[PDB]
């Protein structure tokens, strides 16, 4: 049947201010089937304390999940979301851009 690949947005809960606590979000949507792997990364390393929302779906039956963790943005640290799904040959990495 259908396989639909995830859309991915990486963003902060609050406006990012260097040195100030916040939450880093990776929102994955539009995927099918529901099995999916999502990590948040800091300078390429997986963050262990990440939580996620309960599985739900949209009008077109596609799934969505929010993965998140508490973080402190800085000028130099890089954050990203890494996603694997049956539709992907290799994991997809999407870097966080604070303006997006």
């Amino acid at each position: 049947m259908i396989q639909r690949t995830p859309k991915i947005q990486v963003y902060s809960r609050h406006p990012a201010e260097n040195g100030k606590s916040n939450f880093l979000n990776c929102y994955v949507s539009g995927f099918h089937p529901s099995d999916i792997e999502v990590d948040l990364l800091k300078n390429g390393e997986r963050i262990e304390k990440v939580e996620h929302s309960d599985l739900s779906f949209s009008k077109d039956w596609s799934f969505y999940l929010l993965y998140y963790t508490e973080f402190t943005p800085t000028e130099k640290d890089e954050y990203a979301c890494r996603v694997n799904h049956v539709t992907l040959s290799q994991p997809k990495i999407v870097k966080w851009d604070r303006d997006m």
């Binding site: 809960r13 939450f23 979000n25 929102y27 929302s53 929010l66 998140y68």
Partner: peptide, 9 residues
Amino acid sequence: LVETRPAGD
């Protein structure tokens, strides 16, 4: 336009 997204709060 981006897809409407949850803040988490």
